[PDB]
Design a protein around this ligand. Sequence first.
Ligand code: HEM
Lengths: 416, 97
Amino acid sequence: KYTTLSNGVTVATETNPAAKTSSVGLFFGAGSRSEHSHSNGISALTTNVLASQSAKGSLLTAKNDREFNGIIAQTTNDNITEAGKLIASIASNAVDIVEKTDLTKHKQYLSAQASAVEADPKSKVLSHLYSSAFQGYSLALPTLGTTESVENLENQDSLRHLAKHLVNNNTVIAASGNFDHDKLADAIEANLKIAEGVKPEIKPASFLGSEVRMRDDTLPKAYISIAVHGEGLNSPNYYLAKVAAAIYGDFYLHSTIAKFTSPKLASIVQEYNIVESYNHYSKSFSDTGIWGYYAEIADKFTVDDFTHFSLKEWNRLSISISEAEVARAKAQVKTALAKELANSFAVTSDIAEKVLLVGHRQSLREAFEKIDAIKVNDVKEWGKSKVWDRDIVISGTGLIEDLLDYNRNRNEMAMM
Amino acid sequence: CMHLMALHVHGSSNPVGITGNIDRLPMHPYFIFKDLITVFVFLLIFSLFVFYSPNTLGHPDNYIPGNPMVTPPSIVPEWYLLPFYAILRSIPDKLGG
Ligand code: HEM
């Protein structure tokens, strides 16, 4: 349900009587993708400063996504309207709050987060993969900025960022839970007061096949990731890309089902225990995406074997995927979509992301209908178009001596 | 084959001399296609010789059937053994040579 208030801001809510808890949040787009190297991380810092305000009993948290930012005030159902007002206040006084703020403490917090994403091997690998894939464009920048750039941010920078991006045309109030939509809309309208402005032009980005290798021989595993130019939220292949990713699905060697998971790659890598774990994903940004896998290999001598087998299984995508695999992938993608949309916090984040970045959100039933329309031939056409023989972007962290340089993995993308 | 085994045990050296272990490349996409450049240059020069002026490296007297009763004016090995032959003549004593 949608209602465009005065100021032109849009309130989008997905109310469900069965919701355990309610959530309402203001999102104003312009994540890291809107920043540049010198002032990178300013969006995350501003959102953290706003989210650090008095919560009046609610749970105020920052979002800090790649392309959009926002503050979400989780709260029980009956309190939702209050939370509404809260965030409205927090955003009608955003410039005042930033001005009166001593950014020191918030900057050590953001630097701690930036170090965290540079220590968690998967976070580091995926951040490096995104940076190298879209190198040269703002989309390459970290969501939370780097430790070198965070410390160089000042209040005036955050004020300029808010003035540019915290405008009615670039902001959305998303909500979910069990409440009357009209009550929340009325409560926010009386309290929301933000500057006018045009929606900032979203910066361009183009995929560039590349390889980045942070080899740290002191780590205990090899955390690699390989991906191709995926499908953005706009592309009609979005769900098709998710189905293609789920065809290969996840795998954890020590999990009980490791010996029974359907995907062929799982059966292949367990013969010599090539890999410890992997997960296929289709990350989707506003207009471009990254479709691939992340993997952790325990045996440093089998990174090449895993890459070879995974890329061969990708080659299967354009030739030999059976109706069983396509049906399994469809069912698993539908279940994953429904799982991702259970928590009211997740529903609010999803509503904000879609409404800001594509303008319209497909209901879950519409998404199910769109996925069920996929046939095996559609998946193979997508594999031919986007996976078969397309440039790949690679990343690795530790014990990657066995990760053969680009040309080997790239040539694996087209050998039968 | 023994040469290649002794090469594989410790690998090949570098123009810089320092250890290559820090940065080593596979061979199939790298140095196999360099091997092809070297092989085709080799075959191109080998064709320039085999088809055009193939007897340049040889000695004309080798086309006169062997006759023990007449020694040719000069005795020289085929070109690639000339250095050692020279050494052989530099030392007067036959055993010394
Ligand atoms: C049919 C004759 C030969 C073959 C097929 C052969 C084979 C090879 C191959 C494949 C390599 C690696 C590529 C290279 O380093 O150039 C190599 C290197 C080498 N060749 Fe040979 N070899 C032959 C004769 C010889 C001879 C007669 C010598 C010395 C008297 C020699 C000394 C070497 C050495 C020392 C290396 C190691 C080079 C390095 O690691 O820097 N080879 N050989």
